[PDB]
Amino acid sequence: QVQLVESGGGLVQAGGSLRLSCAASHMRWYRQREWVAAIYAGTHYADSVKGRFTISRDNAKNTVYLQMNSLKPEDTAVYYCFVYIGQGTQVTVS
Amino acid sequence: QVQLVESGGGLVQAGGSLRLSCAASHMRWYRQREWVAAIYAGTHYADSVKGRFTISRDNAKNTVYLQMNSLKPEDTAVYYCFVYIGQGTQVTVS
Amino acid sequence: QVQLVESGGGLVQAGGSLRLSCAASHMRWYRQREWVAAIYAGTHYADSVKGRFTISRDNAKNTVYLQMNSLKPEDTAVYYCFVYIGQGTQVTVS
Amino acid sequence: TGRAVIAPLTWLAVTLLTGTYYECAASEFASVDHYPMFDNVSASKREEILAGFPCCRSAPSDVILVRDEIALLHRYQSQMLGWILITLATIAALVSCCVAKCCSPLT
């Protein structure tokens, strides 16, 4: 009965900021599939995105927000959400 | 009942100065998590940030002040406070 | 009831001279932390700064003055006073 | 008996002189009340870091110097223990010979 829907996909130039909002109707974040971040307010990140991405959840909205900072074309992939596999959105950086 | 809030952050370019203030109702300063500085008036500084950082506290205001001079992009990270964990505020240098 | 405060620092170009004045209410000088000079009125200096620094004290003013000559950017550091540790002042040479 | 026990006593003396066994054995029993940096009011992270630093976790985060000191202390203590043991062993041997020269019916 719980479906993870992600929003915020599109095209963002290098060095910009994006917000990927996943709504849930202990979460994890993956990219393609490579693990990115894990949350419970303890947060964990891979060394590839350590100090770059920020993950925050709020029970008021039942949403998980990931902040993409210092984006580069090298990290062009599709981001998925995990608690059940999120459908995910493709983010392209030029 | 003691709440820690990080204040004085933001974005400062290279060569600038920044002041970090935390209100507490033996302190430690951290960045991400990397140990930064600790106090008793006796003070300690990490080798990676030695020669650059300064931490002071006053008992009257129950606040701890961190003095930061000639900042560089290498220290682009979110700073947390420790004694119970502070919220932490993101500080970026470009 | 005794407090140490440093004064006389600033930014001075290469080849110039600067005066350090410390107010106290047998003193040694430290830069950072490396020992610099000592006083009784006999004085002792370190080899790395020998021939450039001269320290004198006066009991009437109850203050210590250090003469630094032919300053260069290679010694850009904040200088502290030890009798208790002084707050210190930052000196930068271009 | 002496030839029987000469091997384990030599083993113990060498191990205590080396001190690495004493270091990896008595690290979790170190004292933290003297160090204000090791307060760790959570009462949980203190024991994990205490058990984890001696092994391979260098972590040069303004902590190594502290840990170095504790190691030295244990090493010093280790040596003392070994020395003490040897002394006691020697004394025991002597008194044993005394029994061999007191309770022996043979001339």
From Swiss-Prot, chain D:
Placenta. The chain crosses the membrane at residues 1-22, 77-100. Residues 23-76 are extracellular. It is found in: Cell membrane. Belongs to the CALHM family. May assemble to form gap junction channel-like structures involved in intercellular communication. Channel gating and ion conductance are likely regulated by membrane lipids rather than by membrane depolarization or extracellular calcium levels. Oligomerizes to form decameric and undecameric channels. Two hemichannels can assemble in a tail-to-tail manner to form a gap junction. This is Calcium homeostasis modulator protein 4. It comes from Homo sapiens. The gene is CALHM4. The chain holds residues 108 to 214 of 314 of the full protein.
